[PDB]
């Protein structure tokens, strides 16, 4: 069978079900499956990377189907079958797609990337399946699983075996540079592989498959000998740098993992062992220097970084250095450094937990977030609203995520404050924006008008004066942001409108400045009267006379600049003519 | 004699305004002549000439606004060949009080070391800016409290405030529009670091901005432009400057920090995100940087594509943040990324596994920059908080650095690479540097090192294809 | 304001010519002597009238908006209008 029959079963039961609970249960499963089901009806159309992602997608989806509790649990015998038929549908798909290539000497990156998609589908899907069923679903006490995947486990491992070995074959013929010996060996390699198109698993041919791979490796053994001579020379040419030498051994690793070449390079591996042992002495001196020389969270980060560095060194050594005898001394001394680093990381996390948990009662660091802390304050000495708060809240969010990313569980008290600090930080960043608007609008008044605006500035600042008498809820703080935005919009609207009336009176004053007065005097006086009544329409918008005095003083100076000039040229018009 | 027509022609406020406009046009033509002509040689040294090369030019700190401000950003345009953008702290003391309350950005040409071509000043701490995806119009910026803000480098020279500092005249361009005005609460509730010009495939103008939170919430904006605006200001749309041309309008919400999370919690469990970059081959493909060591993959209007995450080469999670991304500008769908671990990766978009990964290089310290040279398609520049810079060249080697420079005694705060001519167009791999002492300082690479030999971009596809 | 903007142009790299002209072909602002200012004003006025005529014979539905003129010794630049025009002069680039 095929996964589509599961999805059809949930389609049938959701519609038909002889009680509402069965209809809803089947619909609940039907919807979760429906996401993956649409993709399974499509599976043959999909490109391999979407099928890789589908393993993760189905991993999550089926883990939800198994775990959800609001209806009777999913049927176990059918779960085993479902996992197996998914494995079957993957196997059929992988076999079909990988079968399609001219699977000898195509341009390797395609062949490699298709092979890796298949291999990784199998490796993951085997790993995932026994993880989900055998780890997770046994440990789910609401409904424990009863077993460890039979099609997947056996056929997935077969697919890994063949696809890895075929990946190795292609990579080996790639390692060979051009010479006549490559032609002889490559044709000799193809010939025993012929007829053994290997992607189609067949256990009746599996012995012949093993036998053929033994013939391939025999032809290749003289080729491995020749490759190792050039490889060992290149690795000696780079030998001064441990950084570069290690990076060469990382990239070559599947060629080096060929056990014959592992023994051919052996002095280069023994000198790598000496270099990395001495690097671990340097790392131990570095870690001692970190004990000699928040600071504790930076320490945790650095010792976690060094555990991951020694763990890599030990994993690289586990393939590469093991099968040297010397590796046993490296392995235990590196394990000692790793274990000392784990210890010191736990010591520093517990000490950080003391610093933060002692801060839960003491405001001196800033963690007791409270209404007496001044989020907002006004500098009337600057004309500006200012907004600032404890940097410790930013440090709390930074450190609490960073530890959780390294691998820790945050104490529940610290979690509950960090929930609130996340919401508070978001809204403090909005209050910054609104205050940075109210600072900017001050520049956008012109000097003489500014007394008219005095009422709008004091109203916006009255929202400070009533509120100080709100961390108390993020709801209330969202409303406080909106109140300051509404008042800032009210000011900005009033300012912009009034600035246009001011610019209009500039236009009328330049229109009057344009005019040789004597021969136009009545029209000039009419334009001045129109300007004075225009100013009176601004007074009509509401304002009391005192603000208008400051403005009209400025305007009377402006028209005096124009009148004074037209008088001076009117006097020269008696001299010059 | 003087004629009766002279009086209306000289006097008229419309004809005065015609001299404002005609001289504004004349000014930008003379700047653009300097952008066409000018050389790098105007200063040969004032500073330690560094291990890479022979020659240096400083961006002079004797300009009194810059005299007591430390530096930390550098941003560049690929398509505007030759604009360098620098960003400056508050002074702790001793200059004009008006500027002291404000942060400074300076926009420069590599061939104009005498000073900023334009100076922009800002109501926030800045740390992101990018210059326009076409015809160099505007500078877009992101800030320590989530203002997305815009400068128009064209706007007269006198709608913006100005001061004569000592003898000399400078203007300090207030930003032409800000998000802060927007009445409904849809702006970034977070600090920012991505401000990306989404290149195009809604009137007068269209191209897109995408800006990103630390928090994992994305906005996308369009750029839209008034025909002319009243000098009193826009009265409807308040976020604009008095008389301004340009405003930003909002058209996306993507919950990236929830959606692709390796999830154990709701409030710190969501991934902190550290970048966006959009593929130049197709602006519908974007990748995003994370504190979890993933680079995440996405598309704008279609719902699903693959691979979903670019991984580390090692299984499980490798939790050290990624701190810069860059796509080879030559347009292969490949990108460089590097961790605060000192580890580096190189990816092709069509594979979740790195096409290379590295760890062993920068003494395990924080790498704080990785970029692909726009001059040589294979060549990438990496920089560490030990004040080391290194070049790597994927056609020469992929074991580590091909060349290394340690600067001393000055620490390095910021480093950026210069823009993209063709080699016969005189391509020019210059590095701009900033010291903790606060000067900005340009070092030029040897043209044999900076300019490619035959077919290097294809030769790099052949590397990725042979691997 | 406007005088400072003319001073700003007068100060630029390799720049010295600034002339403002009326549709009677006579100048109104200068950083140059009146005889030379009027030589440039009269010549550019003749040349604008032929330019606008030429654009209207090319396409009667179109009209002139800018003129730029590059010579081995200098480049001359012209911003026309119905009533008024600006001339500027610069060394080559």
């Amino acid at each position: 069978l095929t996964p589509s029959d599961e999805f059809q079963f949930w389609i049938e039961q959701a519609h038909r079900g002889n009680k509402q609970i069965s209809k809803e249960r089947a619909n609940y499963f039907k919807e979760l499956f429906e996401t993956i089901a649409r993709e399974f009806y499509n599976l043959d159309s999909l490109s391999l990377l979407e099928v890789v992602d589908l393993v993760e997608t189905t991993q999550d989806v089926v883990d939800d189907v198994w775990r959800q509790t609001e209806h009777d649990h999913y049927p176990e015998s059918r779960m085993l079958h479902l996992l197996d038929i998914i494995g079957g549908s993957f196997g059929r798909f992988v076999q079909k797609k990988l079968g399609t290539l001219n699977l000898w000497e195509d341009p390797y990156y395609l062949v490699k990337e298709s092979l890796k998609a298949g291999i990784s589908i199998c490796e993951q899907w085997v790993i995932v399946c026994n993880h989900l069923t055998g780890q997770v679903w046994q440990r789910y006490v609401p409904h424990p699983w009863k077993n460890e995947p039979e099609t997947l486990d056996k056929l997935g491992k077969r697919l890994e075996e063949v696809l890895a070995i075929r990946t190795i074959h292609e990579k080996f013929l790639y390692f060979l540079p051009a010479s006549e010996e490559k032609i002889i060996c490559l044709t000799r390699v193809f010939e025993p592989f012929t007829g053994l198109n290997p992607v189609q698993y067949n256990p009746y041919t599996e012995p012949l498959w093993k036998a053929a791979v033994s013939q391939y490796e025999k032809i290749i053994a003289p080729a491995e000998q020749k490759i190792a001579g050039k490889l060992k020379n290149y690795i000696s040419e780079i030998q001064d740098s441990p950084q570069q030498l290690l990076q060469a051994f990382l990239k070559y690793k599947e060629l080096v993992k060929r056990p014959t070449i592992s023994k051919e390079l052996m002095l280069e591996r023994e000198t790598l062992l000496a270099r990395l042992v001495d690097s671990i002495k340097d790392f131990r001196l570095d870690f001692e220097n970190r004990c000699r020389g928040s600071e504790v969270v930076n320490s945790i980060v650095w010792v976690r970084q060094l555990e991951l560095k020694v763990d890599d060194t030990i994993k690289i050594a586990e393939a590469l250095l093991s099968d040297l005898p010397g590796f046993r001394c490296f392995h235990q001394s590196a394990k000692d450094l790793l274990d000392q680093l784990k210890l010191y990381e736990q010591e520093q996390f517990d000490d950080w937990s003391r610093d933060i948990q002692s801060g839960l009662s003491d405001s001196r660091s800033g963690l007791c977030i409270e209404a007496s802390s001044r989020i907002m304050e006004l500098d009337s000495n600057d004309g500006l609203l200012k907004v600032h708060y404890s940097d410790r809240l930013v440090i709390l969010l930074r450190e609490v995520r960073q530890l959780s990313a390294l691998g820790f569980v945050i104490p529940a008290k610290i979690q509950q404050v960090a929930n609130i600090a996340q919401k508070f930080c978001k809204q403090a960043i909005i209050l910054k924006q609104v205050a940075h608007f109210y600072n900017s609008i001050d520049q956008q008044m012109i000097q003489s008008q500014r007394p008219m605006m005095l009422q709008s500035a004091l109203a916006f600042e009255q929202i400070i004066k009533n509120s100080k008498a709100t961390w108390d809820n993020p709801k209330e703080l969202e409303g406080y942001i909106q109140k300051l935005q509404n008042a800032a919009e009210r000011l900005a609207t009033e300012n912009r409108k009034l600035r246009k009336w001011h610019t209009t009176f500039c236009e009328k004053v330049v229109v009057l400045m344009n005019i040789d007065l004597l021969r136009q005097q009545q029209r000039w006086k009419d334009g001045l009267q129109e300007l004075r009544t225009g100013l009176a329409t601004v007074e009509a918008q509401g304002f009391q006379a005192s603000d208008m005095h400051a403005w009209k003083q400025h305007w009377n100076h402006q028209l005096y600049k124009a009148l004074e000039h037209q008088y001076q040229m009117g006097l020269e018009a008696l001299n010059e003519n | 004699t003087s004629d009766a027509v002279v009086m209306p022609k000289i006097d008229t406020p419309r004809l005065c305004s015609f001299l404002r406009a005609a001289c504004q046009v004349m000014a930008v033509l003379l700047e653009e002549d300097r952008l066409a002509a000018e050389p790098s040689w105007n200063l040969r040294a004032q500073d330690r000439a560094l291990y890479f090369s022979d020659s240096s030019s400083q961006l002079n700190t004797s300009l009194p606004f810059l005299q007591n401000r430390k530096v930390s950003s550098l941003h560049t345009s690929r398509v505007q060949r030759q604009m360098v953008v620098s960003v400056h702290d508050l002074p702790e003391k001793s200059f004009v009080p008006l500027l002291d309350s404000k942060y400074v950005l300076c926009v420069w040409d590599i061939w104009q070391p005498s000073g900023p071509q334009k100076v922009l000043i800002c109501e926030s701490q800045v740390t992101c800016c990018c210059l326009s995806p076409l015809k160099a119009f505007l500078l877009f910026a992101g800030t320590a409290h989530g203002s997305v803000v815009v400068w128009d480098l064209r706007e007269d020279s006198r709608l913006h405030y100005s001061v004569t500092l000592s003898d000399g005249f400078w203007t300090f361009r207030t930003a032409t529009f800000s998000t802060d005005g927007i009445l409904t609460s849809v702006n970034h509730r977070s600090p920012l670091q991505a401000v990306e010009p989404i290149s195009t495939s809604m009137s007068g103008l269209s191209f897109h901005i995408a800006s990103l939170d630390e928090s994992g919430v994305l906005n996308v904006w369009v750029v839209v432009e008034l025909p002319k605006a009243d000098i009193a200001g826009s009265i409807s749309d308040l976020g604009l400057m008095p008389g301004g041309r340009v405003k930003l309008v909002h058209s996306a919400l993507i919950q990236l920090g929830d959606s692709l999370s390796h999830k154990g919690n709701e409030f710190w469990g969501t991934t902190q995100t550290l970048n966006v970059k959009f593929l130049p081959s197709d602006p519908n493909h974007f990748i995003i940087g994370t504190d979890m060591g993933l680079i995440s993959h996405g598309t704008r209007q279609d719902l699903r594509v693959a691979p979903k995450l670019f991984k580390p080469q090692q299984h499980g999670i490798r939790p050290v943040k990624v701190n810069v991304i860059d796509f080879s500008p030559f347009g292969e769908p490949i990108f460089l990324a590097g961790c605060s671990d000192g580890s580096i990766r190189l990816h092709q978009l069509s594979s979740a596994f790195p096409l290379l990964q590295w760890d062993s290089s920068t003494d395990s310290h924080a790498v704080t920059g990785l970029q692909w040279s726009p001059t040589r398609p294979a060549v990438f520049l990496v920089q560490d908080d030990t004040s080391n810079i290194y070049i790597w060249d994927l056609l020469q080697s992929d074991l580590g650095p091909v060349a290394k420079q340690q600067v001393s005694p000055n620490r390095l705060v910021a480093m950026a690479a210069v823009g993209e001519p063709e080699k016969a167009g005189g391509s020019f791999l210059a590095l701009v540097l900033a010291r903790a002492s606060g000067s900005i300082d340009i070092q030029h690479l040897k043209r044999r090192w900076a300019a490619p030999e035959v077919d290097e971009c294809n030769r790099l596809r052949l590397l990725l294809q042979e691997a | 304001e406007v005088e400072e903007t003319l001073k700003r142009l007068q100060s630029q790299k390799g720049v010295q010519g600034i002339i403002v002209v009326n549709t009677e072909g006579i100048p109104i602002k200068s950083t140059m002597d009146n005889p030379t200012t009027t030589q440039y004003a009269s010549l550019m006025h003749s040349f604008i009238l032929k330019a606008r005529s030429t654009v209207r014979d090319i396409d009667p539905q179109n009209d002139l908006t800018f003129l730029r003129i590059r010579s081995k010794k200098n480049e001359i630049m012209v911003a026309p209008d119905k009533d008024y025009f600006l001339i500027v002069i610069q060394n080559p680039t």
């Binding site: 004053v509 402006q558 600049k561 037209q566 020269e572 010059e576 | - | 304001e1």
Partner: peptide, 27 residues
């Protein structure tokens, strides 16, 4: 004239006006 009551388009217009007055005296 006055530093307290500044306004650019007006003040700067008055600078053009004074240049007309001086041009008239030259002419």
């Amino acid at each position: 004239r006055d530093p307290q009551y500044a306004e650019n388009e007006v003040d700067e217009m008055r600078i053009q006006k004074d240049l007309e007055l001086e041009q008239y005296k030259r002419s």
